[PDB]
């Protein structure tokens, strides 16, 4: 029944800053820590993410990890940085510098032991864990590097808990680190087989949505990470709150994974349009389904109609008829039958929660597992190869002891995921 969340890397720490904000919004918990809500449900299932400390203080069940105090400090300095206890800030001193080898292989490795100890302390604080969630970037040093290391140890300690992670996937246009594909390649090599599932977030796609449908001209990462948190929070609240359908994360995982190795997801979100049009929108189930199916409302820079859909999850929040939902999902399946895989009859699955997100009447979360995902892997693998041959920045990595044959195997493994998507693309 409970979940532990660990954030890492500057990305992960800033995403989590919005995530937790939202969760407390959902439950009426003040930036200082106490509960000042107003709904029974708000406290009722609070356990999944909060420990109530003496005084009616709620402690977010999460660990903030970094290798630079300053980022942690900036998180702590805002509202909701006060709700986190000092003991959840685990950090070192001297960066990682966006270096996998430092993060995973060497220096960051050193910190992980202290992180894990706190993890253990929290695992004991829970009655019964459902699982763990981690937030991070695929091409980052602590985000992926150190984060991955941690994941391999947590999974080891808890094989029976859900291990998932959401991660920022290097967008085709904006890479920061020259070896960002290298770090990503290494994380695939480690993560894929050490996780139950991973979500693919593309900032470029997010920037398109924010202007494309939301028509906004000023977003920052906090605004885009709001959208990220909308999908993350969407998933777990249902599990928390009363609904109609089947509201268990593990069951979601079961329904979305047809094969042990292909567990990559494309998140999307509805409704998600500018205020101008809000006066011209109608709120129906087909309306949400139109926004959910549309590739432009995906947060991943993929194109599901290019690939084939293996699995689709449609999560609904708010009062909807069962009939309408059933029929519209069927219609989707029918009309987009050319994209769905024939091996899975009725490949579109649903989940229904009766609690709407604060401020909306209804909402829906799109989760997909298509073959289209392989295109991201292909882009990375290719870029990787070029760098691999030149050893760009690999003296930094090999200087910290990372061996090229390990990287070679990592490359293969990327290619293996692509070939397996092809194996089920048919």
């Amino acid at each position: 029944r409970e979940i532990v969340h660990i954030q890492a890397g500057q990305c992960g720490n800033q995403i989590g800053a919005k995530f937790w904000e939202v969760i407390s919004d959902e439950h009426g918990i003040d930036p200082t820590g106490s509960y000042h809500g107003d709904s029974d449900l708000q406290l009722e299932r609070i356990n999944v993410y909060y420990n109530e400390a003496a005084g009616n203080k709620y402690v977010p069940r999460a660990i903030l990890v970094d290798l630079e105090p300053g980022t942690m400090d900036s998180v702590r300095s805002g509202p909701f940085g006060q709700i986190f206890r000092p003991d959840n800030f685990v950090f070192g001193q001297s960066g990682a510098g966006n270096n996998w080898a430092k993060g995973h292989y060497t220096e960051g490795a050193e910190l992980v032991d202290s992180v894990l100890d706190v993890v253990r302390k929290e695992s004991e604080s829970c009655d019964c864990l459902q699982g763990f969630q981690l937030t991070h970037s695929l091409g980052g040093g602590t985000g992926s590097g150190m984060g991955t290391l941690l994941i391999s140890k947590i999974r080891e300690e808890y094989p029976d808990r859900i291990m998932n992670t959401f991660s920022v996937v290097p967008s085709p246009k904006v890479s920061d680190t020259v070896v960002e594909p290298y770090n990503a390649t290494l994380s695939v090599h480690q993560l894929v087989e050490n996780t139950d599932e991973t979500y693919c977030i593309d900032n470029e796609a997010l920037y398109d949505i924010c202007f494309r449908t939301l028509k906004l001209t000023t977003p920052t990462y906090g605004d885009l990470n709001h959208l990220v948190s909308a999908t993350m929070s969407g998933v777990t609240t249902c599990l928390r709150f009363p609904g109609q359908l089947n509201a268990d994360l593990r069951k979601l995982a079961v329904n979305m994974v047809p094969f042990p190795r292909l567990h990559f997801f494309m998140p999307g979100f509805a409704p998600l349009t500018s205020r101008g049009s809000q006066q011209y929108r109608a709120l129906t189930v087909p309306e949400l389904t139109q926004q959910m199916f549309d590739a432009k409302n995906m947060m991943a820079a993929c194109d599901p109609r290019h690939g084939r859909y293996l699995t689709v999850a449609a999560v609904f929040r708010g009062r909807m008829s069962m009939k309408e939902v059933d029929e519209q999902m069927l219609n989707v399946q029918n009309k987009n039958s050319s994209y769905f895989v024939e091996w899975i009859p009725n490949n579109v699955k649903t989940a229904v929660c009766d609690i709407p997100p604060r401020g909306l009447k209804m909402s829906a979360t799109f989760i997909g597992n298509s073959t289209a995902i392989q295109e991201l892997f292909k882009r990375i693998s290719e870029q990787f190869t070029a760098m691999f041959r030149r050893k760009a920045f690999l003296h930094w990595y090999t200087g910290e002891g990372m061996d090229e044959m390990e990287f070679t195997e990592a490359e293969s493994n990327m290619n293996d995921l692509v070939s397996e998507y092809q194996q089920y693309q048919d």
Binding site: R1, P242, K251, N255, S321, D326
Partner: protein, 428 residues
């Protein structure tokens, strides 16, 4: 003369919520149990509170908590409300085995406690769904034990039939195939309905284009009450549950009678229209009121039972039967003469305050076993096959200890079942 209701899974429990609400409506039972006035279902306290003899099982706290926080929380005994912490995840492998098998002993002991409270246990019935983890997984687990302890008692199951078009559970075929294997062999009779078909009923007869499960389960509750409340109440032909089994199950396999219910009429549709017994039964043989999406005209009938509420005169019934036997296109299997069970209760049909159905003065429930059911299995056959050929999602069962051979086997058992329908279709 007593019986036990068992509600497993959300579907089982939420349907149960409607069911027990209706039983309260049948007698004026207050949420606290106070009844001013049906002890076949209820157990009496010295305060005049009655306890519904039923068990509620959910492996996820939430739905039972919904009960616990609603009005009927005072009605139900805390021990009747059994909850685990974690779910089956849509998966028989956990529902029947890994998870549900841990709590079942408790569950059984509460059942046994109630069995000891019964003085003349006639039997029981289980509410669930063919696709879910607890809905079908745990359910069959229970049957495995109940059929030992209560081998001679009624074992009637009611389950939601997986909609061919909409399903939220990708491994539902796999779940349902495994249940076939284990329920066929243990249960006595399993009934099922299709929410998609029901939607069509809601939109055509009730004129409602917005059905939720809370509507859908009211309609189910109607059907159930006809066979549960009114069969214990007075009538001309008072039919028991054991009698139902003795009049509905023709073979030792299972059989799966499907529900049909007429009247299902909106208030406005009731105006300007006079139903007779015969007219209602005419509606009962129309595909249009068939609660499962399966064409009555496709198959052949094997069994049929008609149960009457309110203003029904056997005289009229007899005439109605004559015409359904001779006027209709109802093909039937040789084996069977048309001995259709007629239950005739004087007990009037009841309506949920604030519901969709019109107040009616008479009502007819129909159970039927048609050969068209094999097509339903055919649907499952291919859905299963597709997944199984690719081995999609297989690791979610294998990791819990399931065997691939077992899955093949279960499919084969279904195939055998289809073959037996084929057999019955061959007239002889």
């Amino acid at each position: 003369r007593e019986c036990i209701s068992i509600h497993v899974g959300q579907a089982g429990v939420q349907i149960g919520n409607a069911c027990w609400e209706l039983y309260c409506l049948e007698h004026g039972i207050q949420p606290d149990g106070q009844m001013p006035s049906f002890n076949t279902f209820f157990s009496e306290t010295g305060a005049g509170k009655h306890v519904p003899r039923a068990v509620f099982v959910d492996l996820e706290p939430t739905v039972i908590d919904e009960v616990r926080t609603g009005t009927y929380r005072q009605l139900f005994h805390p021990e009747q409300l059994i909850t685990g912490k974690e779910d089956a995840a849509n998966n028989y492998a956990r529902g029947h085995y890994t998870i549900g098998k841990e709590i079942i002993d408790l569950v059984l002991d509460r059942i046994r406690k109630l069995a000891d409270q019964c003085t003349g246990l006639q039997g029981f019935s289980v509410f669930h769904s063919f696709g879910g983890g607890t809905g079908s997984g745990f359910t069959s687990l229970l049957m495995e034990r109940l059929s030992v302890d209560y081998g001679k008692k009624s074992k009637l199951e009611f389950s939601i039939y997986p909609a061919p078009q909409v399903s939220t559970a990708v491994v539902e075929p796999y779940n349902s195939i495994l249940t076939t294997h284990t329920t066929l062999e243990h249960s006595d009779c399993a009934f099922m309905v299709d929410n998609e078909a029901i939607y069509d009923i809601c939109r055509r007869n009730l004129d409602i284009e917005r059905p939720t499960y809370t509507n859908l389960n009211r309609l189910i509750g109607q059907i159930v009450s006809s066979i549960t409340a009114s069969l214990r109440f007075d009538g001309a032909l008072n039919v028991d549950l054991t009698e139902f089994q003795t009049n509905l199950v023709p073979y030792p396999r299972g059989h799966f009678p499907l529900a049909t219910y007429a009247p299902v009429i909106s208030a406005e549709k009731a105006y300007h229209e006079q139903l007779s017994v015969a007219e209602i039964t005419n509606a009962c043989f129309e595909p249009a009121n068939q609660m499962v999406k399966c064409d009555p005209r496709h198959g052949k009938y094997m069994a049929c039972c008609l149960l009457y509420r309110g203003d029904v005169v056997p005289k009229d019934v007899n005439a109605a039967i004559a015409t359904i036997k001779t006027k209709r296109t109802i093909q039937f299997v040789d084996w069977c003469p048309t001995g259709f069970k007629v239950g005739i209760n004087y007990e009037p049909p009841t309506v949920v305050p604030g519901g969709d159905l019109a107040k009616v003065q008479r009502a007819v429930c129909m159970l039927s076993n048609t050969t068209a059911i094999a097509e339903a299995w055919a649907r499952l056959d291919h859905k299963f096959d597709l997944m199984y050929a690719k081995r999609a999602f297989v690791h979610w069962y294998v990791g819990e200890g399931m065997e691939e051979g077992e899955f093949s086997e279960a499919r084969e058992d279904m195939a055998a079942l289809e073959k037996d329908y084929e057999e019955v279709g061959v007239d002889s």
